[PDB]
Chains A and B, each alone.
Chain A
Amino acid sequence: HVPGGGSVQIVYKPVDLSKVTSKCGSLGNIHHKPGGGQVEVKSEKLDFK
């Protein structure tokens, strides 16, 4: 007989962050909205016709 055991394997496994996916509201934007209307439309020059 040959004594000294057979063989036994270690428990060890590789690791990864799985390309995981979540929500982001901030990622959906790069630009701001244009301004409101700064201009008068009511004014009249009061000509006596």
Chain B
Amino acid sequence: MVKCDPRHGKYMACCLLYRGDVVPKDVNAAIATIKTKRSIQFVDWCPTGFKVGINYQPPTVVPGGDLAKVQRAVCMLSNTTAIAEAWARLDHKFDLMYAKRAFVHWYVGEGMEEGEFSEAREDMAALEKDYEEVGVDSVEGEGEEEGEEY
């Protein structure tokens, strides 16, 4: 329900949030088999990727409207390297108009400064390197290493 594809990076953190007809074994096995899938890839430093909540109470819906009942439901909250493509979209979209100084006069006519505008873009150029570094497989020499097979 963010459109960036989670194949495009690596999970760091997850929270599962169940409601209704759910028992904790069923969940532990749902999580372990997602954990097993190294296609559901996690950053190569993360071991304990999941946090888990379980409510007894089901979601009710509003009457007459588009959302229908289920016996069990799940929300999920997950931090992932794959969203660096949308931050890169917010880079590119800023850079293309700011190279021309397009729409600037509306903000600067409220007395805001060109200095602050440039620091905001600079903080997001740091943010691109923040997502990129957590994306590194904890490299600390001149290459990477492996056992016999993954």
Contacts and interface: CB of A to CB of B under 8 A. Distances in A.
Contacts of B44: none
A45 B99 CA distance: 6
A44 B99 contact: yes
A46 B100 CA distance: 10
A48 interface: yes
B139 to A, nearest CB: 23
A43 B125 contact: no
Contacts of B122: 48
A48 B121 CA distance: 10
Interface string B113-150: 00000000110010000000000000000000000000
Contacts of B45: none
A46 B122 CA distance: 10
Main SS class of interface, B:
helix
A42 interface: yes
Given A48-B122, A48-B125, A42 B98 contact: no
Nearest to A42: B101
B95 A43 contact: no
16 contacts: A40-B100, A42-B100, A42-B101, A43-B99, A43-B100, A43-B101, A44-B98, A44-B99, A44-B101, A45-B99, A46-B95, A46-B98, A46-B99, A46-B121, A48-B122, A48-B125
Interface of B: 95, 98-101, 121-122, 125
Given A43-B100, A43-B101, A46-B99, 13 more contacts: A40-B100, A42-B100, A42-B101, A43-B99, A44-B98, A44-B99, A44-B101, A45-B99, A46-B95, A46-B98, A46-B121, A48-B122, A48-B125
